[PDB]
Amino acid sequence: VGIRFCQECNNMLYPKEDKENRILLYACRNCDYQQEADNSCIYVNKITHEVDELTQIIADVSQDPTLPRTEDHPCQKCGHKEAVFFQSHSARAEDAMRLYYVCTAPHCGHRWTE
Amino acid sequence: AYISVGSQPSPILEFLEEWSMENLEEISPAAIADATKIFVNGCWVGIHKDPEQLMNTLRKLRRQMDIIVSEVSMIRDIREREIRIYTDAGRICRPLLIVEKQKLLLKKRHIDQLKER
Amino acid sequence: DEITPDLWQEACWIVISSYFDEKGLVRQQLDSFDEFIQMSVQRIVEDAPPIDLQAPPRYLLKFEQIYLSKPTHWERDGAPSPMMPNEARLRNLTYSAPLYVDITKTVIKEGEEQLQTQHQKTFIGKIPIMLRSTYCLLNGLTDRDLCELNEC
Amino acid sequence: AERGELDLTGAKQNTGVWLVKVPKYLSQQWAKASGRGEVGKLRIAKTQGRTEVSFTLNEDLANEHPFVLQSVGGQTLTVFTESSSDKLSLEGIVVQRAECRPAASENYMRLKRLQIEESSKPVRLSQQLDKVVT
Amino acid sequence: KDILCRLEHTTLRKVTANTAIYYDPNPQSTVVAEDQEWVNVYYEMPDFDVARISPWLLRVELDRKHMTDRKLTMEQIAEKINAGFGDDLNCIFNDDNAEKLVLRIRIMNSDENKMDDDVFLRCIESNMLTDMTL
Amino acid sequence: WVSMLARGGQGAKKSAIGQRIVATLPYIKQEVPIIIVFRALGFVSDRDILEHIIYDFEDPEMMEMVKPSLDEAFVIQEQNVALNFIGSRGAKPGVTKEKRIKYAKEVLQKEMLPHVGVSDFCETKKAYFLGYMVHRLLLAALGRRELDDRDHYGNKRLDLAGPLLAFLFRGMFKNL
Amino acid sequence: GPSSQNVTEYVVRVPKNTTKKYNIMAFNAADKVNFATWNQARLERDLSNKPEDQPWLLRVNGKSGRKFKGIKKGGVTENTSYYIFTQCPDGAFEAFPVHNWYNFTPLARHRTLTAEEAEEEWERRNKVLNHFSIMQQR
Ligand SMILES: [Zn+2]
Ligand SMILES: [Zn+2]
């Protein structure tokens, strides 16, 4: 799943196997450089791709004046009463009406979903 | 509605350089992720690590008409970590009353002064 | 102090009145034209590369500064006169202002001698003038003055 | 030993230098002094768990400049010089980055307004003629 | 509803949670303990693959909800994949009791015994997800 | 224009790699792969090009989006080779390679993203902006950013008499 | 100790003119440069154009070491300045303006497909198979 570049010419490293050792290797095309593979997973394709939207949220959104603010959902970390909530509005979800809360307290960008 | 006539972005660019904005030619690409891109008239000028302070400063300057003229647009896309500044002609704008702390900055003294226009 | 709701309706239309007392209703037209004459025309002339001739003597031409006079009309006898907008409407004239530019001509004759002459205010054409713009004759005329010119 | 060879003695000495960006007025004042021999003094105050860096403008030069440090891990900056004798040399490696900011909040903008006015002084614009050129 | 399922097109992508490709050199200790629990059972007395087996592995995780909605069975999917590709690929799947539905896919042993062995498995992955009809 | 090819095309190689990004530069008949344009700018190593397109390598979803584009331009691994490739499609055929490279540099220097810069030292500035365009395209494809609305008047300008007249005057003064 | 409340003050000196101009050399952090291995270094102007208005070319340890190409920074510091502070025995800081800013990017040293040969690989527009094998032929 990870992406690596050869230390020689900083080009994309692609997977390759060695029959003699039967161990996964990452080899650079234009460089002939080789590296020992530690992940063992060439790639993972997520059809559902249920990526946690909380990671995608930016804590700075609390500074948006147009986002609604609720005092009924205190921050779980710092306990601040005021919080700003919004919807994902991210494509490829095929369904999105749940609210994502972000603590409005400065220096506490805590984010959660009820 | 008013249509902006346009003005030079030079004063804004100079102020941004004076302010704590890192030039695009001097930074490393790794620093762009956390910082917010600064666009002036569609040209990516640099990045800033304190967008909230910069926007407050920019808004203060435009309201005081110090370095930023009235018809200059300052847009901060908080989600996209971008600050877009526009100075060119053809932008449609309208005058709006400023509100701070749920209070109009327009007070009775302004109305009284206008009454004797 | 603070505008109470009982006085907001009067207060807001005092604000709107002052806006139109200043801006008017065709401000976008006039401001755009004023910028073109005041800034764009000069910038376009300044941005133009100097004309270099070489075919030996070398001639350089640089267009320095732009001048614009009042909208003028020339009688068949050649006498200039200010062109009132009403005269332009009646006599089917074009409301245009003469355009002049300062041109500096420097010649290098390969003899290590440079001769520089400036042709101040060289006529380069006529720019149609938007009415009631900063460069229009009606600009800065009181309503009484406009009536004397048969202008509404 | 060759003309194109670059001296690396400074790097071998692990020489440390600081990269600082300064405003125009501070540089302009230094240029105005023309290098008399002194333009100010840099003061560094280190606390139990914090460090403070500031620069003081010379009183004669005028007739505070707090310094904000920046992380250097984002880039590796080294200084190289080209001597007039055509002998390139590496002065050293930058070990800290800082920025100089003014102390004035609002009154500073007045200086900028003049500076913007000075910058716009040579911006020529069309002139209006009372009479048609004859 | 039985007629509805028999008509509405269902490709592998619909009931597939995710697909991953691992090198998987040793089939016994394939990737992680989760596969170890049931992969051995197939490999205690394996058939039609004792000769050889491709190194690269294509692991498919199937959504339980989507499978239940269309009343699809893992054996049927394996037969469908087997029918489409014949003996070109070897399909190993876990029992339905396990909370996670898995389906290990590899390439024929005869080929193991020209494009590439990992890129080709990638082509099959996309081919099975969209073109293959369940 | 920076465009991502549709997935409609069916193939073992096309389907596996995904969708590739191509750039429609001015004065070029045919679409140019995006990674070639970055090579022509002076960024050869994949790490360097991706640093201008992807600002966070920790995100794997965006990295996989540019992989098909890297493979498309794998043949071109030098700036001069990339410049020749763009010049080959130029407005006029290049008699010799030197003319092609010079023409390609001419287009990139001034005809491509002129607002970013029109000088010879603006390659880094154009690489960042071109990477931002690719980055913007990836966000749209990934669904992380909504597609822009043509009807939005934020994305609109009104040409009044001034800009209109100035456009005419530039042509007339050049004629003069 | 004294470090908990240490206070230091140093003077600033700005010499009028210096015999040697000061420039800035920048390397990417991901490049992982190592000055210890820099046994030899050669810095010469590039010859691609064929002087002061051309990019620089940096060569380290001859052909064996990594080769970097320098490019002058396009941006102009008309409203900004850059200075370098160097420690000296006298203890008074010295500020030297930077004449120019240059960015150096490493150059790969391996068989690169020629432009004429790249045309041949263009026929395999997307029909390319086993991308690894392409460089084996070269
Ligand atoms: Zn390599
Ligand atoms: Zn909180």
UniProtKB/Swiss-Prot annotation, chain A:
In this chain, Zn(2+) 2 is annotated as bound at 75, 78, 103, 108
What transmembrane ranges does the database entry give? none
Where on this chain are zinc fingers (TFIIS-type) annotated? 71-113
Q: Which BP terms does GO give this entry?
A: maintenance of transcriptional fidelity during transcription elongation by RNA polymerase II; transcription by RNA polymerase II; transcription initiation at RNA polymerase II promoter; transcription-coupled nucleotide-excision repair
- Has keyword NADP? no
Provide the binding site for Zn(2+) 1: 6, 9, 28, 31
PROSITE patterns the UniProt entry points to: RNA_POL_M_15KD (PS01030), ZF_TFIIS_1 (PS00466), ZF_TFIIS_2 (PS51133)
- Classification via Gene3D superfamilies: 2.20.25.10
Q: What UniProt keywords are attached to this protein's entry?
A: Acetylation, DNA-directed RNA polymerase, Metal-binding, Nucleus, Transcription, Zinc, Zinc-finger
Entry annotated with the keyword Nucleus:
yes
* SUPFAM superfamilies xrefs: Zinc beta-ribbon
Query: Zinc finger, C4-type: residue spans?
Result: 6-31
One MF term from GO for this chain? Answer: nucleic acid binding
Q: How does it assemble?
A: Component of the RNA polymerase II (Pol II) complex consisting of 12 subunits.
What does this chain do?
DNA-dependent RNA polymerase catalyzes the transcription of DNA into RNA using the four ribonucleoside triphosphates as substrates. Component of RNA polymerase II which synthesizes mRNA precursors and many functional non-coding RNAs. Pol II is the central component of the basal RNA polymerase II transcription machinery. It is composed of mobile elements that move relative to each other. RPB9 is part of the upper jaw surrounding the central large cleft and thought to grab the incoming DNA template.
In the record, the note on similarity to other proteins reads: Belongs to the archaeal RpoM/eukaryotic RPA12/RPB9/RPC11 RNA polymerase family.
Its name, as the record gives it, is DNA-directed RNA polymerase II subunit RPB9
Swiss-Prot record, chain D:
Q: Which residues carry this modification: N6-acetyllysine?
A: 21, 32, 121
One cellular component GO annotation, for this chain's record? nucleus
Classify the source by domain of life: Eukaryota
Keyword terms, alphabetized: Acetylation, DNA-binding, Nucleus, Phosphoprotein, Transcription, Transcription regulation
Would the keyword Phosphoprotein be found if you checked this record's keyword annotation?
A: yes
Modification N-acetylalanine occurs at: 1
GO MF term set: DNA binding; RNA polymerase II general transcription initiation factor activity
Subunit organization:
Heterodimer of an alpha and a beta subunit. Interacts with HTATSF1 and GPBP1. Interacts with URI1. Interacts with GTF2B (via N-terminus); this interaction is inhibited in presence of GTF2F1.
Q: What does this protein do?
A: TFIIF is a general transcription initiation factor that binds to RNA polymerase II and helps to recruit it to the initiation complex in collaboration with TFIIB.
Query: What protein name does the entry list?
Result: General transcription factor IIF subunit 2
Organism from which the protein derives: Homo sapiens (Human)
Classification from the root reads: Eukaryota, Metazoa, Chordata, Craniata, Vertebrata
From Swiss-Prot, chain G:
PTM entry text: Phosphorylated on Ser and other residues by TAF1 and casein kinase II-like kinases.
Q: Which conditions up-regulate this protein?
A: Up-regulated in response to enterovirus 71 (EV71) infection.
What subcellular compartments does it reside in?
A: Nucleus
Annotated TM spans? none
Positions of modified residues (Phosphothreonine): 114
| Assembly description | Heterodimer of an alpha and a beta subunit. Interacts with GTF2F2, CTDP1, TAF6/TAFII80 and URI1. Interacts with GTF2B (via C-terminus and preferentially via acetylated form); this interaction prevents binding of GTF2B to GTF2F2.
The protein's job, in short, is: TFIIF is a general transcription initiation factor that binds to RNA polymerase II and helps to recruit it to the initiation complex in collaboration with TFIIB. It promotes transcription elongation.
Q: Which family does it belong to?
A: Belongs to the TFIIF alpha subunit family.
Spell out the protein name for this chain: General transcription factor IIF subunit 1
